[PDB]
């Protein structure tokens, strides 16, 4: 049975400016099967009301999904994406880095 680990990218829609409204994205791709759980974290805690794109896939049949929410970044607030998938022993947590 083919199983592939998701690639993960956490980033904002626009280069972040403190006090300015923006969008927090977690893009998961290259995974199989499609069963996946993805959360956005503000200072460790789960953000409710997060939306995602409609499930789709690339030429190699691996799935991809965009999870997102609106937010206004500040100096103190830390954001992360937590991806839970059959292929991962513990959910992978990627921290948002403003320049990645």
């Amino acid at each position: 049975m083919i199983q592939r680990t998701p690639k993960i990218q956490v980033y904002s829609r626009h280069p972040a400016e403190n006090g300015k409204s923006n969008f927090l994205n977690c893009y998961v791709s290259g995974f199989h099967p499609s069963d996946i759980e993805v959360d956005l974290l503000k200072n460790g805690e789960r953000i409710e009301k997060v939306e995602h794109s409609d499930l789709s896939f690339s030429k190699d049949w691996s799935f991809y999904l965009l999870y997102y929410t609106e937010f206004t970044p500040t100096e103190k607030d830390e954001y992360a994406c937590r991806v839970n998938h059959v292929t991962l022993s513990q959910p992978k947590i990627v921290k948002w880095d403003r320049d990645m």
Partner: protein
């Protein structure tokens, strides 16, 4: 330039958790326009781009009707393929389907596509000539013969060269104001010392459409594919895309490096230097 229309189907069985889940999405180029989700409440093919909303109620009734039918087809195929591979009743399995057509700048047919997969790997694919099938394994050989005995390749070609291209052209027209623009990338560079000897140079491309883009590093005018990092092109969430390419350089040597950006929306390819 050229254009494509593409449909993606995903059926996933879930033994014990009820009936299989079915998702369908449709694309024109890199823009999604329709969606169906068998678990959603509406039970309708739904719009995802403004220009498709101008299609009447009859369009939506037929699309809804056919996508539902496809989901039932995948449903029995799921059971049938479980038999071919001698799989047990209790595991979760996946059928994926992609099909669509390409047209040239003039609107002419260029090529068609039809590919299926089972559990993440190739099952059966229509060949370039739209006339024959390539079956990846032994269970698909059985399916390959069923489809030869049904002349399904002609029927595929009928859609791909018929309704596919002509509704593509229609969509492109009804959405000219949006589907035929190229947003060029807004570029910038960042610079971060790693230590007292090294720094990261990162070349950014933002807000571009379509997704096809090339970022490449050079050192003294020669391609550098070594101590570089390229991220997968990614959706910004507003219809445009992002990409970046980074390089670790010796301190004081950043002026030797250039980032080059190729995109359809650019009158000519950019060169960036720190």
């Amino acid at each position: 330039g050229s254009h494509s229309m593409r449909y993606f189907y995903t059926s996933v069985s879930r033994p014990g958790r009820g009936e299989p889940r079915f998702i369908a999405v449709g694309y024109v180029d890199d823009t999604q326009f329709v969606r169906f989700d068998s678990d959603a409440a509406s039970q309708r093919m739904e719009p995802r781009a403004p220009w498709i909303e101008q299609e009447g109620p009859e369009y939506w009734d037929q699309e809804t009707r056919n996508v539902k039918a496809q989901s039932q087809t995948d449903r029995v195929d799921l059971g049938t393929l479980r038999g071919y591979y001698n799989q047990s009743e209790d595991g979760s399995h996946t059928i994926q389907i992609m099909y669509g057509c390409d047209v040239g700048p003039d609107g002419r047919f260029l090529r068609g596509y039809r590919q299926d997969a089972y559990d993440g790997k190739d099952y059966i694919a229509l060949n370039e000539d739209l006339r024959s099938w390539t079956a990846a394994d032994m269970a698909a050989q059985i399916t390959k013969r069923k489809w030869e005995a049904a002349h399904a390749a002609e029927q595929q070609r009928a859609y791909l060269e018929g309704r596919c291209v002509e509704w593509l052209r229609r969509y492109l027209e009804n959405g000219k104001e949006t589907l035929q623009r190229t947003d060029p990338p807004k570029t910038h560079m960042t610079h971060h010392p790693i230590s007292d000897h090294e720094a990261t140079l990162r070349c950014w491309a933002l807000g571009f459409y379509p997704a096809e883009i090339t970022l490449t590093w050079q050192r003294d005018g020669e391609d550098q594919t070594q101590d570089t990092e390229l991220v997968e092109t990614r959706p910004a969430g507003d219809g445009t895309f992002q990409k970046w390419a980074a390089v670790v350089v010796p301190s004081g040597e950043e002026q030797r490096y250039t980032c080059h950006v190729q995109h359809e929306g650019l009158p000519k390819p950019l060169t960036l230097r720190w």
